[PDB]
Design a protein around this ligand. Structure first.
Ligand SMILES: O=c1ccn([C@H]2C[C@H](O)[C@@H](COP(=O)(O)O)O2)c(=O)[nH]1
Length: 119
């Protein structure tokens, strides 16, 4: 139900941020709970209106990484955050890459809502 969608927002959605620098990743990766116990190595924050993002679920089906056919593609502004390797928990550190790019998301439910950030 809601819980997976809620995890998607928390992990991957930040509409009004310009993002795109390391202080952003460093700040948001801890604020959004991806720094507890261990550092998450890679994460994408989508800088897009939530309803616009949900609109991607209504486009044609394509194949997910794992095999399934409930994935959808859209182009959105993101900040990708990658762990620096010097980084060690609990003080996680990240490098930011800002770009507008194609993402792939898995949707499920009625109505269809984003549930996993595929690619
Ligand atoms: O190009 C890629 C490839 C992999 N991931 C990572 C980010 C997500 O945190 C993870 C999948 O997270 P779930 O939403 O599936 O839990 O895959 C990306 O962000 N971008």
């Amino acid at each position: 139900q809601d819980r997976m969608y809620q995890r998607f927002l928390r992990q991957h959605v930040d509409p009004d941020a310009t993002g795109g620098n390391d202080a952003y990743c460093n700040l948001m990766m801890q604020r959004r709970k991806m720094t507890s116990h261990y550092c998450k190595r890679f994460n994408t924050f989508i800088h897009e209106d939530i309803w616009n993002i949900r609109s991607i679920c209504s486009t044609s089906n394509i194949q997910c990484k794992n095999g399934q056919m409930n994935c959808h593609e859209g182009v959105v502004k993101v900040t990708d955050c990658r762990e620096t390797g010097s980084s060690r928990a609990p003080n996680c550190r990240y490098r930011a890459m800002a770009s507008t790019r194609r993402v792939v998301i898995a949707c499920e439910g009625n109505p269809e809502v984003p549930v996993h950030f595929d690619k």
